[PDB]
Structure 1
Amino acid sequence: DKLWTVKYAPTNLQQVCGNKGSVMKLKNWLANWENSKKNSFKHAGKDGSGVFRAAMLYGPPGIGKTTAAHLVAQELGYDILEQNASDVRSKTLLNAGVKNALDNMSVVGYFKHQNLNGKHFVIIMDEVDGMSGGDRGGVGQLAQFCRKTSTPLILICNERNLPKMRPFDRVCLDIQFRRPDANSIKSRLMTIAIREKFKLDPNVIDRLIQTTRGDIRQVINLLSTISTTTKTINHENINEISKAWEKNIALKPFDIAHKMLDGQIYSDIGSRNFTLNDKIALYFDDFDFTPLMIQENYLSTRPSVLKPGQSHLEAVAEAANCISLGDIVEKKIRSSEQLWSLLPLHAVLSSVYPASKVAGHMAGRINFTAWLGQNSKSAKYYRLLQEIHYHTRLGXXXXXXXXXXXXXXXXXXXXXXXXXXXXXXXXXXXXXXXXXXXXXX
């Protein structure tokens, strides 16, 4: 009846697939909070989680952040007072609302009372990187609370390295959540399936995760599509329903790359059963991923379409070039909300053409696009190198920094005696080091 992500939502931190390291880091902080307070938050314990009034969770969509924060709170007996983007968190309302609970106790904490925190709040300011123009000065006031609160404060966001999030930098314990581990999600998904009365090839359960880029919430929803679609599952159906489901609802981006890369469609015969018009049309079946898909695996095929006496390499270079050209086209299509009339050309230059040059037998296997997550790595690191520059600009363009900050690595990693010497003799602090350490790594 209820969505699956709901009915199968963790009930104990003992069910959060992944980030277990960060969950611990979280739970701890929420434990030593009373003491951290007792000590005026000036004793950064062996964890550092001691000089921070509030914690800042962050990471990709559907990986357990909101589940952890809530759960870690309910586990230490505290009562929860949460807000999110659906609420108005402007500086005005913020100061006329929650500001008042920063040093207050739960009225529910009484009619519930052995609980040691039952009468205390854990403020969960969720979806903070979602505070728009409907929250004037919200981040500022919120970042000010991280310094003057008298109760645990937990903030969640997806992009910690954003400009809007700058005011939060030095003010709180930011624990990172990365994309859960496949085995974790694979194991979890299995458990689900079993309880849902069905089985699935570990190769299917595997590529899903790969498509979902780790979004455990998405896979769960995506996995509830089978039983919800068909009326009655049977002994045999299980093995075949995967097809219609996988090649349609689930891994559709794959059945596209498959068809597109099948040489049988480019041979004189099939060449007219599945016309040029159809090949181009396959593109409009997911014009979002199709270009990414072809580029991803146009070089992992055993071509059957090569002209007589044409090497696999040569034909690839031709598609390589076309892939390149199609890009030029895309950029322009995305430079003017009014250029969609160029998509057909892009269909040809980014998929159909490159494909026809190497279509045939599938040597390896259709892989999801590497470009997306690969675009996260590069981006998430430019932000780092950036803040590092806006700290060394005192001592070359941000570019000349990553192409000259090589020597620095030595006199900052070399042996790790002369510790303090170089470190401080650089005008760097704690975060100035922890940050420069990440990228350099």
Structure 2
Amino acid sequence: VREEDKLWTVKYAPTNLQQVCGNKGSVMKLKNWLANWENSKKNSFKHAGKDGSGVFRAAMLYGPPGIGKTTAAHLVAQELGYDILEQNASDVRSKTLLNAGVKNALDNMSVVGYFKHNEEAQNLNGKHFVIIMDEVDGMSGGDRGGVGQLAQFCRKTSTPLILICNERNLPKMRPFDRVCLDIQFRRPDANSIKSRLMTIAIREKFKLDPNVIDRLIQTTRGDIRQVINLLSTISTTTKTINHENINEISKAWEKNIALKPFDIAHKMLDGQIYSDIGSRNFTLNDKIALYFDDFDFTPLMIQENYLSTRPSVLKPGQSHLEAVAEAANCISLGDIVEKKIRSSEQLWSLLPLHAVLSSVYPASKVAGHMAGRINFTAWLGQNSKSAKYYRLLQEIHYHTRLGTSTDKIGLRLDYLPTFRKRLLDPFLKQGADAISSVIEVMDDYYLTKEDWDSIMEFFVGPDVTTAIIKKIPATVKSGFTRKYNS
């Protein structure tokens, strides 16, 4: 092996913790967490401490790629005497063999730490393992991939567990919410990377000035690996870099990453984009690509927060209400288009049209400043709640079908306003001696206690029984529960 055969990112890789750039707080927190790991296992993780690290036996590092998560993890692993072990998605990771291996390795000692050196007074921890998992977000979605298996692994283990992923808040990563201590590595500061670039430039005889690293890391968006690769790629031809050719370099190395459904909502509802000047800079093709970055949450977010802005593109003689009405009309048209898309015939070739009608046109109608905060779309939770209520109403209707002889909606609209007066009202106006009447009325339609509980949740407006059931004396409720349980 020679020197010119490795990339600049490998020959300038950090050899110790004192050369990492930025995120000093995170690396110190993880170092303290790994240091007190045996102090945490000797008392079974009950004492968390002042740092709050010690109750969780696993640590999950999450942040953008290329900021030094894996590097810092490996560095602290070699520095604290822990015998390092790495396994990731590049190797086979399933529910069958990965689970078996990790289970056999959670409370087994290392032979490498035993045979290498075990006689000097270095540490009693060399016999231990540190299972460092990389690309945790790269596993398969289902349980067969091993994400839930690893989540359960982070609950029962005698060796420190280190998890490293690039994307944290994902559905697949939901089980890791309350099981492992979360550490977030953030965008590094400009000074440390500036000094590192100064050093790596003076070492390679690369002419470079301090005025350009700011724009460089701005267009790179906090990625030291990409910056190093950029310098290694362009330093071979252009020996001296300055403020003359930096424009072409920034335009050719623009990081094209898809935005989250929250930044997409900010860019869509930005009034400067739709101005006469901003139109010829962020063209309509870019606006459609914005929606195509995430075409599942963009229309919902747009419909949620299109009427929560202050418009700055109002035509002369048009109020905010008119623009909101036109935006809602286009939202309805885009909804019709989406229904035509995600139905039979699979008219997916209409996806670009759904880009304009659902997101682009309503946002353009009410583009401007953001008044409050970008609120997440509540249509998902409302749909889930409506589905649960529909399932409950279906159970109630199929229980009462033997007597009602009506439909689901016909039972919800008209029958429930009378079932409320029949079941619950005798409890408020008669006391605890009206239990038998309610029991007979419920058995007349084969109702259950769970059905009685679910019935009182359908009413709204001036009839909210959530406090009426609490106003009922607890004696009557206990007597009813005991009577129905006999």
Change over 3 Å in CA distance of 1:317–1:296 after alignment to 2 = same
In structure 2, relative to structure 1, the CA distance for the partners of 1:74 and 1:281 (3 Å cut) is closer
**Residues 58, 163 of structure 2: 8 Å contact kept:** yes
Separation (CA, whole Å) in 2 of partners of 1:190 and 1:324: 56
Maintained 8 Å contact 2:206/2:240? no
Equivalence map 1:39-50=2 (5 Å): 39-50=43-54
**Deviation of residue 132 (structure 1)?**
2.0
Change (3 A) 1:243 1:158: closer
Evaluate the alpha carbon distance shift between residue 147 and residue 240 of structure 1 in structure 2; reply closer, same or farther with a 3 A threshold: closer
Structure 1 Cα separation of the partners of residues 382 and 68 of structure 2: 22
Instruction: Tell me, in whole angstroms, the C-alpha distance in 1 between the residues paired with 2:164 and 2:185.
Output: 10
Deviation digits for residues 236-273 of structure 1 (CA, Å, limit 9, x no counterpart): 99999999999999999999999999999999999999
- Please list the CA deviations of residues 19-75 of structure 1 after superposition, one character each: whole Å capped at 9, or x if unmatched: 100100000010000010001111111111111111111011111111111111011
Which region of structure 1 is more displaced relative to structure 2, 230-239 or 59-68? 230-239
Does the Cα contact within 8 Å between 1:73 and 1:79 map onto a contact in 2? Answer: yes
Kindly provide the CA deviation profile for residues 398-422 of structure 1, in whole angstroms up to 9, marking residues without a partner as x. Answer: xxxxxxxxxxxxxxxxxxxxxxxxx
Contact 2:208 2:240 in 1 (8 A): no
Cα shift readout 1:291-317 (whole Å, capped 9, x = no counterpart) = 999999999999999999999999999
Aligned mates of 1:203, 1:192 — CA distance in 2: 16
CA contact 1:80–1:121 (8 Å) conserved in 2 = yes
- Residue 184 of structure 1 and its aligned partner are, at CA, apart by 2.0
Separation in 2, partners of 1:211, 1:385 = 54
Distance 2:375 2:244 in 1: 28
Q: 1:300, 1:204 → 2: CA distance? A: 39
The corresponding residue for 2:19 is 15
The one-character-per-residue Cα deviations of 1:339-390 (angstroms, maximum 9, x if unpaired) are 9999999999999999999999999999999999999999999999999999
CA distance in structure 2 between the partners assigned to 1:62 and 1:321 by the alignment: 44
Identity of aligned residues (%): 100
After TM superposition, the structure 1 = structure 2 runs for residues 295-374 of structure 1, keeping only pairs within 5 Å, are none
Deviation at 1:127, TM superposition (A): 0.9
- Over 3 Å counting, the alpha-carbon distance change for 1:225 and 1:311 in structure 2 is farther
Q: Is the 8 A contact 1:208 1:251 kept in 2?
A: no
| Distance change in 2, residues 1:386/1:99 (3 Å) | farther
Q: Give structure 1 stretches of 5+ with no counterpart.
A: 396-440
The one of 19, 34, 37 equivalent to 1:30 is 34
Question: For the residues of structure 1 that align with 2:194 and 2:388, how far apart are their CA atoms?
Answer: 26
CA distance in 2, matches of 1:359, 1:169: 36
Rg (Cα) greater in structure? 2
Equivalent pair of 1:18/1:181 in contact (CA under 8 Å): yes
SS at match of 1:240: helix
1:107-128 deviation per Cα after TM superposition (whole angstroms, max 9, x unaligned): 1102221243222211101110
Moved more, 29-38 or 160-169: 160-169
When residues 249 and 52 of structure 1 are mapped into structure 2, their CA distance, relative to the original with a 3 A threshold, is closer
User: Quick one: structure 1 residues 340 and 171, their matched pair in 2 at CA, closer, same or farther if it must change by over 3 Å?
Assistant: closer
Alpha-carbon distance, 1:94 to partner: 2.1
- Secondary structure of the structure 1 residue equivalent to 2:116: coil
The answer to whether the Cα contact below 8 Å between 1:143 and 1:168 also exists between their aligned partners in 2 is yes
Measured in 1, the distance between the counterparts of 2:308 and 2:22 equals 32
Encode CA deviations 1:175-200: one digit per residue, 9 max, x unaligned: 11111112222222222111121122
C-alpha contact 2:151 2:179 (8 A) present in aligned 1: yes
Shift of 1:169: 1.1
Structure 1 residue 280: deviation in Å? 16
Q: Structure 1 residues 129, 337: CA separation in 2 closer, same or farther (over 3 Å shift)?
A: farther
1:152: Cα distance to partner? 0.6
Indicate if the aligned counterparts of 1:208 and 1:219 stay in contact, CA closer than 8 A. yes
Deviation, structure 1 residue 100: 0.8
CA-CA distance at 1:277 after TM superposition: 16
Moved more, 69-78 or 367-376: 367-376
Relative distance call for 1:340 and 1:221 in structure 2 (3 A) is farther
- Partner SS for 2:276: coil
Contact 2:258 2:293 in 1 (8 A): no
Tell me: CA distance 1:338–1:262, structure 2 relative to 1, closer, same or farther (3 Å): same
Is contact 1:161-1:380 (8 Å) kept? Answer: no
Shift of 1:2: 1.2
Alpha-carbon displacement from aligned partner over 1:71-96 (angstroms, at most 9, x marks no partner): 11011011111111112221211222
Q: Which of 138, 155, 162 is the aligned partner of 2:146?
A: 138
My pick for the range that moved more, 108-117 or 345-354, is: 345-354
Instruction: State how far apart, in whole Å, the 2-side matches of 1:185 and 1:117 are.
Output: 34
Distance 1:130 1:372, change over 3 A: farther
Higher relative CO (CA 8 A, sep ≥ 6), structure 1 or 2?
1
Residue 262 of structure 1 is matched in structure 2 by 270
In the alignment, which residue of structure 2 is the partner of 1:129? 137
Which one is further off, 167-176 or 345-354?
A: 345-354
- Alignment pair present for 1:57 and 2:61: yes
Question: How many residues were matched structurally?
Answer: 396
SS at match of 1:80: strand
Closer, same or farther in 2 for the Cα pair 1:73/1:335, shift >3 Å? Answer: farther
**1-structure distance, mates of 2:328, 2:50:** 52
Distance 1:97 1:203, change over 3 A: same
The farther-off stretch of 385-394 and 222-231 is 385-394
What is the alpha-carbon distance in structure 1 between the residues aligned to residue 210 and residue 145 of structure 2? 49
CA gap 1:205/1:158 in 2 versus in 1, 3 angstroms: same
Q: Per-residue displacement from partner, 1:148-203 (whole Å, max 9, x unpaired)? A: 11011000112221111111111111111111112222222222111121122323
CA RMSD of aligned residues (A): 9.3
Partners of 1:147 and 1:255 in 2: CA distance: 35
Offset at residue 5 of structure 1 (A): 1.2
Contact 2:141 2:172 survives alignment (8 Å): no
Contact 2:212 2:242 in 1 (8 A): no
Q: CA deviation at 1:142?
A: 0.2
